[PDB]
Amino acid sequence: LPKSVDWRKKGYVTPVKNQKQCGSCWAFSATGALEGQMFRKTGKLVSLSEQNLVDCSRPQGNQGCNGGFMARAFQYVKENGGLDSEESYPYVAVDEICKYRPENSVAQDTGFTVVAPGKEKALMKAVATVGPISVAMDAGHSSFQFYKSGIYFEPDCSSKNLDHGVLVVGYGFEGANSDNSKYWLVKNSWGPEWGSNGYVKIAKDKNNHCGIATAASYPNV
Numbered sequence: 760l761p762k763s764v765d766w767r768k769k770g771y772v773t774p775v776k777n778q779k780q781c782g783s784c785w786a787f788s789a790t791g792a793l794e795g796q797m798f799r800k801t802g803k804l805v806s807l808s809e810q811n812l813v814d815c816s817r818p819q820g821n822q823g824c825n826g827g828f829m830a831r832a833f834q835y836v837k838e839n840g841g842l843d844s845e846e847s848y849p850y851v852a853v854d855e856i857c858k859y860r861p862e863n864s865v866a867q868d869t870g871f872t873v874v875a876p877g878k879e880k881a882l883m884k885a886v887a888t889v890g891p892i893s894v895a896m897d898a899g900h901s902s903f904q905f906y907k908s909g910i911y912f913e914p915d916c917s918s919k920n921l922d923h924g925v926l927v928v929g930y931g932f933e934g935a936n937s938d939n940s941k942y943w944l945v946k947n948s949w950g951p952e953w954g955s956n957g958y959v960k961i962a963k964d965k966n967n968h969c970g971i972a973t974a975a976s977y978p979n980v
């Protein structure tokens with residue numbers, strides 16, 4: 760595998776979005792992964808509708824602004840037979856009634872693939888050969904809220920108790936040593952003003968730091 764990967768450089772990633780005052784992180788992680796996979800198959804990067812996921816995936820177990828799972832979002836897309844674009848189904852950061860319109864569907868999946876739980880080597884393989892991967896992490900510490908640059912490392916992070924869904928768009932390392940200061944390049948959904956232009960580097964190969972590889976998955980297009 761390459762020593763460094765950054766799918767943003769290949770056009771697989773849309774601009775950083777902002778979930779605002781709604782616990783829809785899972786929806787942004789899901790659309791991010793689907794945007795990358797749809798790009799692989801069509802060569803077109805189209806911003807997808809998180810609102811569509813928020814309003815419509817309750818039957819699959821999601822609770823809109825009150826939390827959800829990327830896996831169940833992918834299941835919704837499969838069962839629903841499609842997902843609308845952001846332009847046609849705008850984000851309003853509140854739970855509303857499903858308004859999915861088939862004519863505006865621009866993405867689909869037939870299910871999803873789960874990365875071996877807790878295996879950072881497996882996650883690395885997926886990121887390198889598949890594209891952006893949806894992941895869950897423990898981002899509940901104040902250190903994460905205040906992240907600005909460098910490699911994020913929180914001694915109190917849990918690899919089991921996760922509370923935030925984000926997107927791994929690559930990996931690499933700082934300094935000159937390819938085997939040191941390694942990190943996962945993560946796209947957050949708190950706007951471009953947060954962290955490093957909306958992104959955060961999470962310590963990689965540091966015993967599955969913050970559970971980055973505990974619940975990773977990607978939609979099958």
Ligand SMILES: *[C@H](CS(=O)(=O)c1ccccc1)[C@H](CCc1ccccc1)NC(=O)[C@H](Cc1ccccc1)NC(=O)N1CCN(C)CC1
Nearest residue numbers: 782784785822824825826827828895898899921922923924
């Ligand atoms: C997104 C995380 S966030 O809101 O940006 C946030 C903010 C500050 C610190 C950490 C995280 C949401 C928030 C959900 C929430 C809303 C309101 C009150 C409490 C919580 N979190 C999720 O949706 C997580 C994502 C996830 C995916 C996979 C594995 C582990 C976590 N899921 C979630 O919280 N769920 C799952 C579904 N269930 C019905 C409700 C709770």
